[PDB]
Amino acid sequence: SQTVHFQGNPVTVANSIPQAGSKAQTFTLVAKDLSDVTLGQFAGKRKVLNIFPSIDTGVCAASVRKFNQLATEIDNTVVLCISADLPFAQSRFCGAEGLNNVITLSTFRNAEFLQAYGVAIADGPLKGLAARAVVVIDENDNVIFSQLVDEITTEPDYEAALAVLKA
Amino acid sequence: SQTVHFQGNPVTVANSIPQAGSKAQTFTLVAKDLSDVTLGQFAGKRKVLNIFPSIDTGVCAASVRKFNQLATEIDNTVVLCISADLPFAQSRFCGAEGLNNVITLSTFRNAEFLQAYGVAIADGPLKGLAARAVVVIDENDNVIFSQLVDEITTEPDYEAALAVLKA
């Protein structure tokens, strides 16, 4: 298990986020129309897993859409914005509005994803939600960047994620 | 299991909804402030479990709030509006705001509730959501009325539920 912070308060997160070098575990998640989406449907693309406690917070942080946009301007890239919010709530996401190759996916019937990817919050009020995390997977499903964000309310190292994506 | 319908197509619902005469099982669900709420916190009251596939559908039918208000106009009655939506989304529900004794509760980290109460959609695109159902529990924690609604988009027999609460 890992420890992150919320309002600078400590939060346990299950297992261990995948490390660069490792093979990405397969998953199934749910799209905004309630269809099932698997990692294998993105075979040969680079994938960013952009993992949030919620994407239904009522505030549109500029940094979210900025990264999503920069990431998908790189050829052969898809960004998967993942959270425990139901598809009904994710459907009006702003970070994905107006951007191709940015897809929202929900964990509501696939809780095993959050365990497998080391991002399941295990205690406190946010128990059951995902930690803030970014995971970059290459064309052959190898992890090439991961970060479990130390303060859930602050930005990931987008610059570092983008550098791996290009390189 | 049980079979209901969604826009006329058959939908499997796990186990069996508790029938009139059944003992109400304890449960824990999550409130709007991410706190845990248990059945035992309503000791001494009659409780109506008003169970929805989602309360964040973008459409608020007037029948929903009407029932909630009529029910809570009966002395010693609380209405628990229960769904898989996260607490973040349950703020867009039209049927609880401004009505005392009408409370929204989420199943998102208590999936066992939907199993124990025979309301877990087991197949189809709605898998993982609750079926539409009403369960009335009395002061002895006995179930005195229940209905697993045949067509998930249509109203329960609110008249029958209200009658059981009066008598």
Coordinates of C-alpha atoms in Angstrom, one line a residue:
Chain A
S1 CA 0.0 0.0 0.0
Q2 CA 0.9 3.6 -0.6
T3 CA 0.1 6.9 1.1
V4 CA -1.2 10.1 -0.5
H5 CA -2.8 13.2 1.0
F6 CA -6.1 14.9 0.9
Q7 CA -6.4 18.4 2.3
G8 CA -2.8 17.6 3.3
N9 CA -4.3 14.6 5.4
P10 CA -3.0 11.0 4.8
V11 CA -4.9 8.6 2.7
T12 CA -4.1 4.9 2.1
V13 CA -4.1 3.6 -1.5
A14 CA -4.1 -0.1 -2.2
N15 CA -1.3 -2.1 -3.7
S16 CA 1.3 -0.4 -5.9
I17 CA 0.9 1.7 -9.0
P18 CA 2.5 0.0 -12.0
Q19 CA 6.1 0.9 -12.7
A20 CA 7.8 1.8 -15.9
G21 CA 9.1 -1.3 -17.6
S22 CA 6.2 -3.5 -16.5
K23 CA 3.4 -4.9 -18.7
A24 CA 0.1 -3.1 -18.4
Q25 CA -2.7 -5.4 -16.9
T26 CA -5.7 -5.8 -19.1
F27 CA -9.0 -4.0 -18.0
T28 CA -12.5 -3.5 -18.9
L29 CA -14.2 -0.1 -18.2
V30 CA -17.5 1.5 -19.2
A31 CA -18.0 4.3 -21.8
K32 CA -20.5 7.1 -21.8
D33 CA -23.1 5.0 -23.7
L34 CA -22.7 2.1 -21.2
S35 CA -20.7 -0.1 -23.6
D36 CA -17.6 -2.0 -22.4
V37 CA -14.2 -0.8 -23.4
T38 CA -11.1 -2.9 -23.1
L39 CA -7.4 -2.0 -23.2
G40 CA -7.1 -4.2 -26.4
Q41 CA -9.4 -1.9 -28.3
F42 CA -6.5 0.5 -28.3
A43 CA -3.8 -1.9 -29.6
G44 CA -0.8 -0.2 -31.1
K45 CA -1.7 3.3 -29.8
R46 CA 0.1 5.0 -27.0
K47 CA -2.4 5.4 -24.1
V48 CA -2.5 7.9 -21.3
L49 CA -4.5 6.7 -18.2
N50 CA -5.6 10.0 -16.6
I51 CA -7.1 8.9 -13.3
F52 CA -9.2 11.2 -11.1
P53 CA -11.2 10.9 -7.8
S54 CA -14.0 12.7 -9.6
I55 CA -14.5 14.4 -12.9
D56 CA -17.9 15.7 -11.6
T57 CA -16.6 18.4 -9.2
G58 CA -18.3 21.4 -10.8
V59 CA -15.0 23.2 -11.4
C60 CA -13.2 23.2 -14.7
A61 CA -9.5 23.3 -13.9
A62 CA -7.6 24.7 -17.0
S63 CA -4.7 22.4 -16.5
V64 CA -6.8 19.3 -17.1
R65 CA -7.9 20.1 -20.6
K66 CA -4.5 21.6 -21.5
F67 CA -2.8 18.3 -20.8
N68 CA -5.4 16.3 -22.7
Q69 CA -5.0 18.6 -25.6
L70 CA -1.2 18.5 -25.7
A71 CA -1.2 14.7 -25.3
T72 CA -3.6 14.1 -28.2
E73 CA -1.7 16.5 -30.5
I74 CA 1.1 13.8 -30.4
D75 CA 0.3 11.3 -33.2
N76 CA -1.1 7.8 -32.3
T77 CA -2.1 8.8 -28.7
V78 CA -5.4 8.3 -26.8
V79 CA -6.2 9.7 -23.4
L80 CA -8.5 7.7 -21.2
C81 CA -10.0 9.9 -18.4
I82 CA -11.0 7.4 -15.8
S83 CA -12.9 7.7 -12.5
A84 CA -15.6 6.1 -10.3
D85 CA -18.2 8.7 -11.5
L86 CA -21.1 6.9 -13.4
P87 CA -21.2 7.4 -17.2
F88 CA -24.2 9.8 -16.7
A89 CA -22.0 12.2 -14.7
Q90 CA -18.9 11.8 -17.0
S91 CA -20.9 12.6 -20.2
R92 CA -20.6 16.4 -19.7
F93 CA -16.8 16.4 -18.9
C94 CA -15.0 19.5 -20.0
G95 CA -11.5 18.0 -20.2
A96 CA -12.7 15.9 -23.1
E97 CA -15.0 18.5 -24.7
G98 CA -13.9 19.4 -28.2
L99 CA -11.0 16.9 -28.3
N100 CA -10.8 13.8 -30.3
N101 CA -9.0 10.8 -28.9
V102 CA -10.0 11.8 -25.3
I103 CA -12.6 9.3 -23.9
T104 CA -14.1 9.1 -20.5
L105 CA -14.4 5.7 -18.8
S106 CA -16.0 4.7 -15.5
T107 CA -15.0 2.0 -13.0
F108 CA -18.6 1.6 -11.5
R109 CA -18.8 -2.1 -12.4
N110 CA -15.1 -2.8 -12.7
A111 CA -13.7 -2.0 -9.2
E112 CA -10.9 -4.5 -9.9
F113 CA -9.3 -2.0 -12.2
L114 CA -8.5 0.3 -9.2
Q115 CA -7.0 -2.6 -7.3
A116 CA -4.9 -3.8 -10.2
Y117 CA -3.6 -0.3 -11.0
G118 CA -2.7 0.6 -7.4
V119 CA -5.1 3.6 -7.3
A120 CA -7.9 2.4 -5.0
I121 CA -8.4 4.7 -2.0
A122 CA -8.7 2.3 1.0
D123 CA -9.9 4.6 3.8
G124 CA -11.4 7.8 4.9
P125 CA -14.2 9.7 3.2
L126 CA -12.9 9.0 -0.3
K127 CA -12.8 5.3 0.2
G128 CA -14.0 3.7 -3.0
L129 CA -12.8 6.5 -5.3
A130 CA -9.6 6.5 -7.4
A131 CA -6.5 8.4 -6.3
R132 CA -5.1 11.0 -8.7
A133 CA -2.7 9.2 -11.0
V134 CA -1.2 9.3 -14.6
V135 CA -0.1 6.1 -16.3
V136 CA 1.4 6.1 -19.8
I137 CA 1.4 2.9 -21.8
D138 CA 3.2 2.4 -25.1
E139 CA 2.1 0.7 -28.4
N140 CA 2.9 -2.8 -27.1
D141 CA 1.2 -2.3 -23.7
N142 CA 4.4 -1.6 -21.7
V143 CA 4.2 1.0 -19.0
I144 CA 6.6 3.8 -19.7
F145 CA 5.5 6.4 -17.1
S146 CA 3.6 6.4 -13.9
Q147 CA 2.9 8.7 -11.1
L148 CA 0.6 8.4 -8.0
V149 CA 0.1 12.1 -7.1
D150 CA 1.2 12.8 -3.5
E151 CA -1.5 15.5 -2.9
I152 CA -4.8 14.4 -4.5
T153 CA -5.9 18.0 -5.2
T154 CA -2.7 19.1 -7.0
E155 CA -1.4 18.5 -10.6
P156 CA 0.4 15.5 -11.8
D157 CA 3.8 16.0 -13.5
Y158 CA 2.3 16.6 -16.8
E159 CA 5.6 17.9 -18.3
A160 CA 7.3 14.6 -17.5
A161 CA 4.4 12.5 -18.9
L162 CA 4.4 14.6 -22.1
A163 CA 8.2 14.1 -22.4
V164 CA 7.8 10.3 -22.3
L165 CA 5.0 10.4 -24.8
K166 CA 7.1 12.2 -27.4
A167 CA 10.3 10.3 -26.7
Chain B
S1 CA -32.8 -14.3 -9.9
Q2 CA -35.6 -12.1 -11.2
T3 CA -36.5 -10.6 -14.5
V4 CA -37.6 -7.1 -15.2
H5 CA -37.5 -5.0 -18.4
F6 CA -35.7 -2.0 -19.7
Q7 CA -37.5 -0.3 -22.7
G8 CA -39.1 -3.8 -23.1
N9 CA -35.9 -5.9 -23.2
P10 CA -35.5 -8.5 -20.3
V11 CA -33.1 -7.6 -17.5
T12 CA -31.8 -10.1 -14.9
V13 CA -31.9 -8.9 -11.3
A14 CA -29.9 -10.9 -8.7
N15 CA -31.3 -12.9 -5.9
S16 CA -34.9 -11.9 -4.6
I17 CA -36.2 -8.6 -3.4
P18 CA -37.5 -9.0 0.3
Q19 CA -41.2 -9.7 0.4
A20 CA -43.7 -8.4 2.8
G21 CA -43.0 -10.6 5.9
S22 CA -39.2 -10.6 5.4
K23 CA -36.7 -9.4 8.0
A24 CA -35.0 -6.2 6.8
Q25 CA -31.2 -6.8 6.7
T26 CA -28.9 -4.1 8.1
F27 CA -27.0 -2.0 5.5
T28 CA -24.5 0.8 5.3
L29 CA -24.6 3.4 2.5
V30 CA -22.9 6.8 1.9
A31 CA -24.4 10.3 2.3
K32 CA -23.8 13.5 0.4
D33 CA -20.9 14.5 2.8
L34 CA -19.2 11.0 2.3
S35 CA -20.2 9.9 5.7
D36 CA -21.5 6.3 6.4
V37 CA -25.3 5.9 7.2
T38 CA -26.8 2.7 8.6
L39 CA -30.3 1.3 8.8
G40 CA -29.9 1.3 12.6
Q41 CA -29.6 5.1 12.6
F42 CA -33.3 5.2 11.7
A43 CA -34.4 3.0 14.7
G44 CA -37.9 3.6 15.7
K45 CA -39.0 5.1 12.4
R46 CA -40.6 3.6 9.3
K47 CA -38.2 3.7 6.3
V48 CA -39.0 3.8 2.6
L49 CA -36.1 2.6 0.4
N50 CA -36.8 4.3 -2.9
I51 CA -34.3 2.6 -5.2
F52 CA -33.3 3.9 -8.6
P53 CA -31.0 2.9 -11.5
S54 CA -29.9 6.5 -11.4
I55 CA -31.1 9.8 -10.0
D56 CA -28.8 11.7 -12.4
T57 CA -30.6 11.1 -15.7
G58 CA -31.0 14.8 -16.7
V59 CA -34.8 14.5 -16.4
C60 CA -36.8 14.9 -13.1
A61 CA -40.2 13.3 -13.4
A62 CA -42.7 15.1 -11.2
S63 CA -44.0 11.8 -9.7
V64 CA -40.7 11.3 -7.9
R65 CA -40.8 14.3 -5.7
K66 CA -44.5 14.0 -5.2
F67 CA -44.2 10.6 -3.6
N68 CA -41.3 11.7 -1.5
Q69 CA -43.3 14.6 -0.1
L70 CA -46.5 12.6 0.5
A71 CA -44.6 9.9 2.2
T72 CA -42.8 12.2 4.6
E73 CA -46.1 14.0 5.4
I74 CA -46.9 10.7 7.2
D75 CA -45.7 10.9 10.8
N76 CA -42.5 9.0 11.7
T77 CA -41.4 8.1 8.1
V78 CA -38.0 8.7 6.4
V79 CA -37.5 8.2 2.6
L80 CA -34.0 6.9 1.5
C81 CA -33.5 7.6 -2.2
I82 CA -30.8 5.1 -3.1
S83 CA -28.7 4.6 -6.3
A84 CA -25.2 3.8 -7.6
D85 CA -24.6 7.5 -8.5
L86 CA -21.7 8.9 -6.5
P87 CA -22.6 11.5 -3.8
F88 CA -21.3 14.2 -6.2
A89 CA -24.0 13.5 -8.8
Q90 CA -26.9 13.0 -6.3
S91 CA -27.0 16.8 -5.9
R92 CA -28.7 17.1 -9.4
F93 CA -31.8 15.0 -8.1
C94 CA -35.0 17.0 -7.9
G95 CA -36.7 14.9 -5.3
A96 CA -35.0 15.5 -2.0
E97 CA -34.0 19.2 -1.8
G98 CA -36.1 21.1 0.7
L99 CA -37.9 18.0 2.0
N100 CA -37.1 17.1 5.5
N101 CA -36.7 13.4 6.1
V102 CA -35.8 12.7 2.4
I103 CA -32.2 11.7 2.2
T104 CA -30.0 10.6 -0.8
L105 CA -27.7 7.6 -0.3
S106 CA -25.1 6.0 -2.6
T107 CA -24.1 2.4 -3.0
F108 CA -20.7 3.1 -4.7
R109 CA -18.6 1.5 -1.9
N110 CA -21.4 -0.8 -0.6
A111 CA -22.3 -3.0 -3.5
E112 CA -23.3 -5.7 -1.1
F113 CA -26.5 -3.7 -0.4
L114 CA -27.9 -4.3 -3.9
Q115 CA -27.1 -8.1 -3.6
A116 CA -28.7 -8.4 -0.2
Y117 CA -31.8 -6.5 -1.2
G118 CA -32.3 -8.4 -4.5
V119 CA -32.0 -5.2 -6.6
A120 CA -28.6 -5.6 -8.5
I121 CA -28.9 -5.6 -12.2
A122 CA -26.8 -8.6 -13.3
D123 CA -26.8 -8.3 -17.1
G124 CA -27.1 -6.0 -20.0
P125 CA -25.8 -2.4 -20.3
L126 CA -27.3 -1.5 -16.8
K127 CA -25.2 -4.2 -15.0
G128 CA -24.0 -2.8 -11.7
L129 CA -26.9 -0.3 -11.3
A130 CA -29.9 -0.9 -9.1
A131 CA -33.2 -1.9 -10.5
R132 CA -36.2 0.4 -9.8
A133 CA -37.8 -0.8 -6.5
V134 CA -39.6 0.4 -3.5
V135 CA -39.2 -1.4 0.0
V136 CA -41.1 -0.2 3.1
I137 CA -39.6 -1.2 6.4
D138 CA -41.4 -0.7 9.7
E139 CA -40.3 0.1 13.3
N140 CA -39.6 -3.6 14.0
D141 CA -37.4 -3.7 10.9
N142 CA -39.9 -5.9 9.1
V143 CA -40.6 -5.5 5.5
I144 CA -44.2 -4.5 5.0
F145 CA -44.3 -3.6 1.3
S146 CA -42.0 -4.2 -1.6
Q147 CA -42.2 -3.9 -5.4
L148 CA -39.5 -4.7 -8.0
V149 CA -40.9 -2.6 -10.8
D150 CA -41.6 -4.5 -14.1
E151 CA -40.4 -1.8 -16.4
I152 CA -37.4 0.2 -15.0
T153 CA -38.4 3.4 -16.7
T154 CA -42.0 3.4 -15.3
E155 CA -43.4 4.4 -11.9
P156 CA -43.7 2.1 -9.0
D157 CA -47.1 1.6 -7.3
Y158 CA -46.7 4.6 -5.1
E159 CA -50.4 4.5 -4.0
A160 CA -50.0 1.0 -2.5
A161 CA -46.8 2.1 -0.6
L162 CA -48.5 5.2 0.8
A163 CA -51.5 3.0 2.0
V164 CA -49.2 0.6 3.9
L165 CA -47.6 3.6 5.6
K166 CA -50.9 5.0 6.8
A167 CA -52.4 1.7 8.0

